[PDB]
Structure formats: C-alpha cells, structure tokens
mmCIF file of N, CA and C in Angstrom:
data_model
loop_
_atom_site.group_PDB
_atom_site.id
_atom_site.type_symbol
_atom_site.label_atom_id
_atom_site.label_comp_id
_atom_site.label_asym_id
_atom_site.label_seq_id
_atom_site.Cartn_x
_atom_site.Cartn_y
_atom_site.Cartn_z
ATOM 1 N N UNK A 1 -24.823 -13.013 23.281
ATOM 2 C CA UNK A 1 -25.386 -11.987 22.552
ATOM 3 C C UNK A 1 -25.814 -12.640 21.378
ATOM 4 N N UNK A 2 -24.696 -13.559 20.710
ATOM 5 C CA UNK A 2 -25.172 -14.343 19.494
ATOM 6 C C UNK A 2 -25.536 -15.809 19.855
ATOM 7 N N UNK A 3 -26.256 -16.138 21.023
ATOM 8 C CA UNK A 3 -26.731 -17.591 21.362
ATOM 9 C C UNK A 3 -28.088 -16.934 22.107
ATOM 10 N N UNK A 4 -29.010 -16.873 21.291
ATOM 11 C CA UNK A 4 -30.465 -17.033 21.609
ATOM 12 C C UNK A 4 -30.890 -18.478 22.097
ATOM 13 N N UNK A 5 -32.309 -18.676 22.309
ATOM 14 C CA UNK A 5 -32.832 -19.898 22.661
ATOM 15 C C UNK A 5 -34.311 -19.844 21.991
ATOM 16 N N UNK A 6 -35.216 -19.082 22.578
ATOM 17 C CA UNK A 6 -36.544 -19.014 21.444
ATOM 18 C C UNK A 6 -36.598 -17.692 20.902
ATOM 19 N N UNK A 7 -37.203 -17.985 19.507
ATOM 20 C CA UNK A 7 -37.509 -16.806 18.669
ATOM 21 C C UNK A 7 -38.683 -16.106 18.825
ATOM 22 N N UNK A 8 -38.856 -14.653 18.485
ATOM 23 C CA UNK A 8 -39.884 -14.086 18.775
ATOM 24 C C UNK A 8 -41.195 -14.660 18.259
ATOM 25 N N UNK A 9 -41.434 -15.089 17.003
ATOM 26 C CA UNK A 9 -42.371 -15.541 16.745
ATOM 27 C C UNK A 9 -42.909 -16.672 17.202
ATOM 28 N N UNK A 10 -41.751 -17.817 17.323
ATOM 29 C CA UNK A 10 -41.832 -18.954 18.108
ATOM 30 C C UNK A 10 -42.362 -18.924 19.457
ATOM 31 N N UNK A 11 -42.238 -17.642 20.414
ATOM 32 C CA UNK A 11 -42.631 -17.298 21.617
ATOM 33 C C UNK A 11 -44.040 -17.366 21.505
ATOM 34 N N UNK A 12 -44.438 -16.646 20.495
ATOM 35 C CA UNK A 12 -46.007 -16.414 20.179
ATOM 36 C C UNK A 12 -46.575 -17.702 19.938
ATOM 37 N N UNK A 13 -46.098 -18.693 19.246
ATOM 38 C CA UNK A 13 -46.702 -19.925 18.900
ATOM 39 C C UNK A 13 -46.808 -20.686 20.273
ATOM 40 N N UNK A 14 -45.483 -20.839 20.965
ATOM 41 C CA UNK A 14 -45.625 -21.739 22.269
ATOM 42 C C UNK A 14 -46.777 -21.127 22.912
ATOM 43 N N UNK A 15 -46.602 -19.986 23.003
ATOM 44 C CA UNK A 15 -47.685 -19.064 24.165
ATOM 45 C C UNK A 15 -49.093 -19.604 23.539
ATOM 46 N N UNK A 16 -49.442 -19.771 21.982
ATOM 47 C CA UNK A 16 -50.651 -20.216 21.667
ATOM 48 C C UNK A 16 -50.674 -21.676 22.186
ATOM 49 N N UNK A 17 -49.978 -22.446 21.869
ATOM 50 C CA UNK A 17 -50.139 -23.870 22.292
ATOM 51 C C UNK A 17 -49.938 -24.027 23.985
ATOM 52 N N UNK A 18 -49.453 -22.990 24.554
ATOM 53 C CA UNK A 18 -49.228 -23.172 25.996
ATOM 54 C C UNK A 18 -48.337 -24.261 26.313
ATOM 55 N N UNK A 19 -47.360 -24.243 25.977
ATOM 56 C CA UNK A 19 -46.277 -25.346 25.902
ATOM 57 C C UNK A 19 -45.103 -24.794 26.778
ATOM 58 N N UNK A 20 -44.097 -25.803 27.116
ATOM 59 C CA UNK A 20 -42.931 -25.384 27.493
ATOM 60 C C UNK A 20 -41.726 -25.756 26.842
ATOM 61 N N UNK A 21 -40.996 -24.696 26.566
ATOM 62 C CA UNK A 21 -39.600 -24.794 25.867
ATOM 63 C C UNK A 21 -38.671 -26.192 26.323
ATOM 64 N N UNK A 22 -38.755 -26.313 27.574
ATOM 65 C CA UNK A 22 -38.146 -27.645 27.925
ATOM 66 C C UNK A 22 -38.814 -28.891 27.936
ATOM 67 N N UNK A 23 -39.799 -28.581 27.413
ATOM 68 C CA UNK A 23 -40.805 -30.060 27.328
ATOM 69 C C UNK A 23 -40.748 -30.052 25.605
ATOM 70 N N UNK A 24 -39.937 -29.473 24.852
ATOM 71 C CA UNK A 24 -40.514 -29.737 23.561
ATOM 72 C C UNK A 24 -38.857 -29.697 22.715
ATOM 73 N N UNK A 25 -38.610 -30.142 21.728
ATOM 74 C CA UNK A 25 -37.424 -30.355 20.767
ATOM 75 C C UNK A 25 -36.742 -29.140 20.618
ATOM 76 N N UNK A 26 -35.463 -29.082 20.122
ATOM 77 C CA UNK A 26 -34.549 -27.658 19.976
ATOM 78 C C UNK A 26 -33.232 -28.223 19.665
ATOM 79 N N UNK A 27 -32.889 -27.689 18.618
ATOM 80 C CA UNK A 27 -31.686 -28.187 17.917
ATOM 81 C C UNK A 27 -31.050 -26.777 17.170
ATOM 82 N N UNK A 28 -31.511 -25.848 17.297
ATOM 83 C CA UNK A 28 -31.065 -24.509 16.939
ATOM 84 C C UNK A 28 -29.276 -24.562 17.026
ATOM 85 N N UNK A 29 -28.815 -23.569 16.870
ATOM 86 C CA UNK A 29 -27.271 -23.365 17.108
ATOM 87 C C UNK A 29 -26.777 -22.594 18.634
ATOM 88 N N UNK A 30 -26.647 -23.978 19.374
ATOM 89 C CA UNK A 30 -26.271 -23.390 20.562
ATOM 90 C C UNK A 30 -27.457 -23.690 21.639
ATOM 91 N N UNK A 31 -28.191 -24.792 21.719
ATOM 92 C CA UNK A 31 -29.108 -25.084 22.555
ATOM 93 C C UNK A 31 -29.947 -24.114 22.384
ATOM 94 N N UNK A 32 -31.225 -24.419 21.964
ATOM 95 C CA UNK A 32 -32.459 -23.615 21.448
ATOM 96 C C UNK A 32 -33.718 -24.502 21.238
ATOM 97 N N UNK A 33 -34.821 -23.639 20.775
ATOM 98 C CA UNK A 33 -35.950 -24.278 20.348
ATOM 99 C C UNK A 33 -36.464 -23.485 19.056
ATOM 100 N N UNK A 34 -36.613 -24.314 17.978
ATOM 101 C CA UNK A 34 -36.949 -23.574 16.824
ATOM 102 C C UNK A 34 -38.394 -23.998 16.138
ATOM 103 N N UNK A 35 -39.133 -23.107 15.446
ATOM 104 C CA UNK A 35 -40.380 -23.636 14.870
ATOM 105 C C UNK A 35 -40.460 -24.925 14.570
ATOM 106 N N UNK A 36 -39.617 -25.334 13.874
ATOM 107 C CA UNK A 36 -39.529 -26.697 13.347
ATOM 108 C C UNK A 36 -39.662 -27.641 14.633
ATOM 109 N N UNK A 37 -38.828 -27.639 15.490
ATOM 110 C CA UNK A 37 -38.941 -28.236 16.666
ATOM 111 C C UNK A 37 -40.198 -28.369 17.408
ATOM 112 N N UNK A 38 -41.026 -27.163 17.489
ATOM 113 C CA UNK A 38 -42.525 -27.072 17.852
ATOM 114 C C UNK A 38 -43.140 -28.227 17.065
ATOM 115 N N UNK A 39 -42.913 -28.195 15.730
ATOM 116 C CA UNK A 39 -43.645 -29.007 14.953
ATOM 117 C C UNK A 39 -43.721 -30.352 15.200
ATOM 118 N N UNK A 40 -42.357 -30.768 15.526
ATOM 119 C CA UNK A 40 -42.000 -32.156 15.632
ATOM 120 C C UNK A 40 -43.054 -32.608 16.952
ATOM 121 N N UNK A 41 -43.037 -31.579 17.941
ATOM 122 C CA UNK A 41 -43.920 -31.989 19.073
ATOM 123 C C UNK A 41 -45.261 -31.947 18.939
ATOM 124 N N UNK A 42 -45.432 -31.089 17.887
ATOM 125 C CA UNK A 42 -46.903 -30.798 17.387
ATOM 126 C C UNK A 42 -47.505 -32.055 16.808
ATOM 127 N N UNK A 43 -46.611 -32.513 15.990
ATOM 128 C CA UNK A 43 -47.011 -33.899 15.367
ATOM 129 C C UNK A 43 -46.794 -35.001 16.008
ATOM 130 N N UNK A 44 -45.946 -34.896 16.948
ATOM 131 C CA UNK A 44 -45.880 -36.199 18.077
ATOM 132 C C UNK A 44 -46.440 -35.918 19.279
ATOM 133 N N UNK A 45 -47.820 -35.297 19.171
ATOM 134 C CA UNK A 45 -48.524 -34.936 20.192
ATOM 135 C C UNK A 45 -49.966 -35.070 19.990
#
C-alpha cells in the first residue's frame, strides 16, 4: 500500500508523450517512475 510506481499526474504526462514506464528513468522510493525521471527521458530524447 505504501509502495506505488506511477503517479496520477505523471500517468497523464506519460499518456501525453505516449511513453512506457519501463522505457524511462525511475528512482522514487521502492522502484517507481517520477515526473523528474520523465524529464530526464524528455531531455535525453
């Protein structure tokens, strides 16, 4: 319960860019994908 992966807002973002969590960075708390991670991919893409 205290170990999520994708965030509500981010899910919308990834949905916008049409990307895959497994295809983008992720360093939250317990294996996840953060908006900052999406940024890294966005900048490195």
